[model samples]
Target: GATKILMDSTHFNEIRSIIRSRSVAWDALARSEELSEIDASTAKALESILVKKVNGKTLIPLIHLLSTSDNEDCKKSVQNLIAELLSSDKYGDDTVKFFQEDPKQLEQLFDVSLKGDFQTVLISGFNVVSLLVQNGLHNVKLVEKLLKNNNLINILQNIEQMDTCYVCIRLLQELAVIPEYRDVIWLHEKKFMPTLFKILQRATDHLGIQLQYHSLLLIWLLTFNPVFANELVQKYLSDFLDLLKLVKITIKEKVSRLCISIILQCCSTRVKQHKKVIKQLLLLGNALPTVQSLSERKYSDEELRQDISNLKEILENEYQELTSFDEYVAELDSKLLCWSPPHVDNGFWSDNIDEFKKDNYKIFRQLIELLQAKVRNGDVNAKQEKIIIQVALNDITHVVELLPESIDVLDKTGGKADIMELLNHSDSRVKYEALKATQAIIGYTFK
Candidate 1:
């Protein structure tokens, strides 16, 4: 049905000449339907002769048209035409230089990309903005102005289209490279990091290669700033290390390099402070062998090689410095309960069970707190959370068995009831683990 409209009439010459006539082009572009009907070859022909044939100001009308147009096809047509003109090979510095001279057009493109309702129009406008950003057309002033709009982060957080996400992440990556812009991003880390982490998690699972790469690249770029770097380690250390484990198995060397470099940035920042907790968590997360195995792989990137070695040395040092007690404390500090070496070992409990008595039975209280915190959540979805709950319940059993005095710490804190409630948990393992813990409490009564 719609195909018949294409057969009607040709008006490329009139439109092209009107566009060539510089000042009045905006009025002629009001024939929105006719403009929307222009095909790619027409767009290409227009692109080829545009610099010589049209004045610089003529393109601004199309930017405005693309932004303000309600005709979906017209927006699509204008988007295609704009993307073509911005092509570096065909137009040289013609359109880009014009935008550089007058970057408000760049802002228009950025705005259209974020605010435009049509998906194709949005992607095309963003591609142009990304091209502009890549060519350094926009400066700190423009970036600040754009940030005030807030749609970039909003769209990025809520954006669903693959094309839009790719361009958006790439633009962020480009911005993150400049030192001044990073401070702006650092302030928004609360929103930005979680968004990136969501993408990274999806990419890690479904293997969306490009999304994974650019997201990691943006993360790596942000990591160069110590505040963002530390924030990453503090907030996203689990996912961060999981990414490292991902690339190692997937053996995507470039991404592996990126993962390592991000860690290196965190480690470098931590060295300036008392954040050795990260190193210990890494050890507790079983990061030593992950780093060690990665070091043996060959990479052409010198910085990556250096990063791995530095990470290796740092982790190895942490590994060396850590006693089993230190390792256990690190795991507790992570607030994640797992069956890491110390958790499953008899010697570990027998030796360190006494240490939990010091400081108002503080360490034991922390362990109970971890269990209660998860228990209070009422329902756990992630198998990891389920396992963590079970593992903590298992630790409680050990505490009640090895140090009968820990029962008071459990009861005084109301943790005894939290564990009792888990007796009806959805997961069989957790229910059993909760049962065993209750059994330990009852057995302590008999003793």
Candidate 2:
């Protein structure tokens, strides 16, 4: 009985000591295994006292200690402390209620929490903001202000701490969803784009796989908007190419798939350049599907068999065309080689700059010269050998640049029809080159 009295006295004194020395409360709680046995009302009262001591100043340190403490009991005590504060009829309860009611309370909390000299405050603040944003309690103005805040920017700039950086990026993603907020975020366009690109660039080389994955995911999300996609492609085409080289094989495939999808959605004019795009897509598809097992492979035999049946049914509805690679190439070659220079009668050459007619004449002259050279070199002796293949390739590139301005005259001269017919040419090289050049010209003009 005396031992019980001594233990009870010591426990109550320890609770009071924890209340006074909030920073030391974690150690006290960890050591007090018997404290759980205390009456709920007593525990509640102790939590209340701790909450009162925690104002804006002590709140951060207390939160830091609680989050990082190694002891489970300490963590439980902190959770209980949060609960007690949130409960009705206490100062802590009032703060929680304010946040619940107005949500803008988060802005003030963030202002204090972000600047607090504790990592826990930053994490906890982000946690609270996430909860608010998820529940649709976010205030647009407050979010915009937080995003532009120099202190927050400073925290985000140090991405070495990825968990923290992840939270920041997520917040930016959330903020970006609002139409009004988009311009505000875009105002930081100079800073935001470069920062995001840097993260994407470094992520490729970073050893932290998860961080790299998240960075890629963020870039993918950001680029879903056409404005962002165009800006990214225009400004960082080289960097984009670098990313293509550095991403994990699987991720590279994913990026390629996204690129294909983006082109499909936003680059309709360019779709006519179908050969190049299709080639890229096929390459990506073959590589991607190989990097990981398909869902069919992971399924049971019955499931896989059902999938196969479904696929068969789908294919039965589609028409199939069979052609050998050689046949296809011959068709392309015939089409490309049969081209005559733009006729002088075509209004495009006459009405446009005087140089237009001259350019066409020069192009044909160059093709003839190349053909003569090839013949002299014995590279070709037959009628097929007379085609100036190199000149044809160069013409295709130049025509692409000129096509948009001369679309009307080119169209009137059976340009599109002639090009399409060339797809069926029997000469493999001529067929392919003709179709490829036509595609480039159509894409550039329409786009």
lDDT of 2 by residue, 179-280 (tens): 455656655655555655566666545224444444455455555556665555545544554443343333424443433333332223333333332233
The Cα error of candidate 2 at residue 239, in Å, is 2.6
* Model 1 TM-score, 2 decimals: 0.67
Measured by TM-score, the strongest candidate is 1
How many Å off is the CA of 239 in candidate 1? 1.5
lDDT of 2 at 171: 50
Candidate 2 Cα errors over 4 Å, as ranges: 1-100, 118-121, 131-134, 177-183, 205-207, 246-248, 251-447
TM-scores for all candidates: the values are 0.67, 0.41
Worst 10 residues of 1 by lDDT: 1-10
Cα RMSD of predicted structure 2: 16.1
lDDT (Cα, tens digit) per residue for candidate 1, span 154-219:
656764655445555665766776677777766666765777778776666622666677788888
